[PDB]
């Protein structure tokens, strides 16, 4: 009865490397720059993934741009939490196979408290024992979690497509669960986990803006496409021009 599970398994992007030189001594600038680079190349793959998500390419192109601009941070934080879970049991932040943050790096990064919050989020994957299929469904849903306060070009269609992917998450749970009561509870837990991303991503957007503004004094380069996305929509997010779409 789940109709998207194998599609989502086949369009899932491969793992991206940072290219960080893990022999240099860590600095704030080296760590945040490396993260920006990794972010750029992950964003390229997130765009190819979003384009392959059934129904997405049927939204107006301006809505596709809006959705990616708004949700890239949430999608990438969620994917990174999943990687941390599957590879180091959420003990360290697994940005890339060649950029793992231990405690020390979290301190040098200058964004320690945000790193701790993101590691707590990965621990939620550990406690819930999130399966790969649930992960893929929820990550697809994260592309439908934020919209402009005035809405999209075709709101009606976005609403129906979002409802369709919510239903798919439920179908995956009931395909895997035991009882109707247990699967209802599981849906509740996993939509709460999705909802809990929003305050984290808000804080991360604030930090991102702070860094973007200070990029010259801090020697933190932002690559081209990240710069254009950030300066395009992060001020609007911080100004309250967007509205989270809650799942629970």
């Amino acid at each position: 009865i789940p109709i998207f599970l194998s599609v989502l398994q086949s369009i899932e992007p491969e793992v991206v490397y940072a290219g960080y030189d893990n022999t240099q001594p860590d600095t704030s600038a080296s760590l945040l720059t490396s993260l920006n680079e990794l972010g750029e190349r992950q964003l390229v793959r997130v765009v190819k993934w979003a384009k392959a998500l059934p129904g997405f390419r049927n939204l107006h192109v301006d809505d596709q741009m809006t959705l990616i601009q708004y949700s890239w941070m949430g999608v990438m934080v969620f994917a990174m939490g999943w990687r941390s879970y599957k590879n180091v049991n959420s003990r360290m932040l697994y940005f890339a196979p060649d950029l793992v943050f231990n405690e020390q790096r979290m301190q040098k990064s200058t964004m320690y408290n945000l790193c701790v919050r993101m590691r707590h989020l990965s621990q939620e994957f550990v406690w819930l024992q999130v399966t790969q299929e649930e992960f893929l469904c929820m990550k697809a849903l994260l592309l439908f979690s934020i919209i402009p306060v005035e809405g999209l070009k075709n709101q009606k269609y976005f609403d129906e497509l979002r409802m369709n992917y919510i239903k798919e998450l439920d179908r995956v749970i009931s395909f895997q669960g035991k009882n109707p009561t247990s699967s209802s509870q599981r849906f509740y837990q996993l939509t709460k986990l999705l909802d809990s991303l929003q305050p984290i991503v808000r804080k991360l957007h604030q930090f991102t803006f702070d860094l973007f503004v200070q990029s010259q004094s801090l020697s933190v380069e932002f690559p081209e496409m990240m710069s254009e996305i950030i300066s395009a929509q992060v001020p609007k997010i911080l100004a309250g021009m967007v509205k989270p779409l809650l799942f629970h």
Binding site: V47, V61, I68, M225
Partner: peptide
């Protein structure tokens, strides 16, 4: 324009 370029591919 870069995001729009990736979308139009």
């Amino acid at each position: 324009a870069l995001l729009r370029y990736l979308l139009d591919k």
